């Protein structure tokens, strides 16, 4: 790939 | 006749060789991409200019090394362009002063992709240049060999276009939510530009990227990219129209998207590739 995207996220208990 | 580098390394009368460590700032140009300008790095002078005229060429065999050896391009010698690697000696540049003047050499690479790149590690060889010095005095014929090394890590563009960044990390708001992806592209001259995403998908539509977080992963969610509300799936070319010298945003936003089953607490991560094409 010409570019590499890294998507970080989180599911928090509620 | 002798030469020296910007850091003072020198090759004396009669020639020899030296290593040249340069900080690179590659850039796409119209039709050719700048790899490295050496007119700030290598300097030469005539030792008896009242009596002797010195002649300097770039000798055939001069070429890229390291990972760049596969690529062809051009060399700009005292303003004019010649093929590179040099298969025939260039014209002659006169040296007629004791003052050190630049050896006016700049190396370029012929685009072979749309917005591709090739990584240069600091300390690796990028070129070997052969300076040939003669005169109008005797039959001196001397070789000054310059081994050009990268002094820093860079990416040399191999295409007509370049990107705001090669590695982008974004952080979503805690689920649910979305975040824009800052990613732009421009081209040296106008090009009909598209792109396509690549990655591991969890759905039939190939539109949700799998959660590959390895420590304490959440469940039942993936990552999905939108372009102002339009879902962008993998391996589908998206057209950007005509892209020129003004940067164009790809318009991308990251979202969480349900993949099936109970959504559980934990981490979410997706790695997504972007690859540009011409249309
Ligand atoms: C008066 O210069 C002649 O005598 C000097 C001493 O022997 C030489 O160094 C000189 O040759 C070097 O300088 C000239 C002028 O730059 C150059 O043409 C030659 O190739 C040597 O570098 C010259 O012979």
Per-residue buried b or exposed e for B196-206, using 16+ beta carbons within 10 Å of the residue's own CB: bbebebbbeee
Verify whether the Cβ–Cβ distance A8 to B271 is below 8 Å: no
Beta-carbon contacts of B20 under 8 Å, excluding residues fewer than 6 positions away, are B5, B9, B38, B41, B42, B146, B147, B148, B149
H helix runs in chain B, sequence order: none
Pocket of ligand 1 (CB under 6 A): B 1, 13, 46-48, 51-52, 54, 135, 137, 140, 142
Of B145, B182, B3, B178, whose CA–CA distance to B63 is shortest? B145
B100 known member of a binding site: yes
Q: How was this structure determined?
A: X-ray
Contact B4, B43 (CB under 8 A): yes
Nearest CA to ligand 1 atom 17: B1
In angstroms, what separates the C-alpha of A2 from chain B's closest C-alpha?
5
Give me Rg for the CA atoms of chain A: 13
8 A C-beta contact, residue B274 and residue B195: yes
Instruction: Name the residue in chain A with its Cα closest to that of B166.
Output: A3
With an 8 Å Cβ cutoff, are A1 and B266 in contact?
no
Distance of alpha carbon B109 from alpha carbon B229, whole angstroms: 39
| Chain A residues touching B181 at Cβ < 8 A | 5, 7
Class of domain B158-279: mainly beta
Tokens 């050009």 identify what position?
Answer: B148
Residue given tokens 């700048």 in the structure block:
B34
In angstroms, the CA B44 to CA B47 distance is 10
Distance from CA of A11 to the nearest CA of B (A): 5
Query: Please, which residues bridge with residue B11 across strands?
Result: B3
Rounded-to-integer distance, Cα B155 and Cα B118, Å? 5
**One fold for both B1-157 and B158-279?**
yes
Please name which of B54, B262, B222 lies closest in space to residue B142, comparing C-alpha atoms.
Answer: B54
Output the CATH code of domain B1-157.
Answer: 2.60.40.1090
Peptide bond into B103 cis (omega under 30): no
CA of B47 to the centre of ligand 1 (A): 6
Return the residue of B nearest to A12 by Cα.
B265
Tell me the C-alpha to C-alpha distance, in Å, between residue B135 and each of B53, B93, B104, B142, B193: 6, 11, 18, 10, 51
Q: What is the DSSP letter of B173?
A: P
Query: Quick check: B84 and B72 in contact, CB under 8 A?
Result: yes
Tokens 């992709």, located at residue: B113
Tell me how far apart the alpha carbons of residues B184 and B189 are, in angstroms, rounded to a whole number.
Answer: 16
Indicate yes or no: CB of B267 within 8 angstroms of CB of A6.
no
Which of A1, A2, A10 is facing B268, going by the closest CB pair?
A: A10
Spatial distance between the Cα atoms of B86 and B187, rounded to a whole number of angstroms: 27
Report helix, strand or coil for B68.
Answer: helix
Structural contact between residues B133 and B92, judged by C-beta atoms closer than 8 angstroms: no
Is residue B99 less than 8 Å (CB to CB) from chain A? no
Label the pairing between strands B54-58 and B93-95. Answer: antiparallel
Report in angstroms the alpha-carbon separations of B271 from B51, B151, B206, B210, B214: 66, 30, 14, 9, 12
| Cα(B117)–Cα(B111) distance, integer angstroms | 10
Is B233 within 8 Å of B197 (Cβ atoms)?
A: yes
The full set of domain ranges for chain B reads 1-157, 158-279
Backbone phi, then psi, for B165, in 5-degree steps? -165, 155
What is the C-alpha separation between B164 and B179, in angstroms, rounded?
18
Tokens of B81: 């362009």
Residue carrying structure tokens 């009669």: B14
Give the angle subtended at the CA of B220 by the CAs of B204 and B225, to the nearest 5°. Answer: 60
Instruction: Copy the structure tokens of residue B268.
Output: 């979410």
Instruction: Look up residue B210 and give its two tokens.
Output: 């799998």
Return the structure tokens found at B38: 């050496």
């Amino acid at each position: 790939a010409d570019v590499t995207i890294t998507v970080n996220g989180k599911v928090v208990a509620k | 006749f002798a030469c020296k580098t910007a850091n003072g390394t020198a090759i004396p009368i009669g020639g020899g060789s030296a290593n040249v460590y340069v900080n690179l700032a590659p850039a796409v140009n119209v039709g050719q991409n700048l790899v490295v300008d050496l007119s700030t790095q290598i300097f030469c002078h005539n030792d008896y200019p009242e009596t002797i005229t010195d002649y300097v060429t770039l000798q055939r065999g001069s070429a890229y090394g390291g990972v760049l050896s596969s690529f062809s391009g051009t060399v700009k010698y005292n303003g004019s362009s010649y093929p590179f690697p040099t298969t025939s000696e260039t014209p002659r540049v006169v040296y007629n002063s004791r003052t050190d003047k630049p050896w006016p050499v700049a190396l370029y690479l012929t685009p072979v992709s749309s917005a591709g790149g090739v990584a240069i590690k600091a300390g690796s060889l990028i070129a070997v240049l052969i300076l040939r010095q003669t005169n109008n005095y005797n039959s001196d014929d001397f070789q000054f060999v310059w081994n050009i090394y990268a002094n820093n890590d860079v990416v040399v563009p191999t295409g007509g276009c370049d990107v705001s960044a090669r590695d982008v990390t974004v952080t979503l708001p805690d689920y649910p939510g979305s975040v824009p992806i800052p990613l732009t592209v421009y081209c040296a001259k106008s090009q009909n530009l598209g792109y396509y995403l690549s990655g591991t998908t969890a759905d039939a539509g190939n539109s949700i990227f799998t959660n590959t977080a390895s420590f304490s992963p959440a469940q039942g969610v993936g990552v999905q990219l939108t372009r102002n509300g339009t879902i962008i799936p993998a391996n589908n070319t998206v057209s950007l129209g005509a892209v020129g010298t003004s940067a164009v945003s790809l318009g991308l936003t990251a979202n969480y998207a349900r993949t099936g089953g109970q959504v559980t607490a934990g981490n979410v991560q997706s790695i997504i590739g972007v690859t540009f094409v011409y249309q």
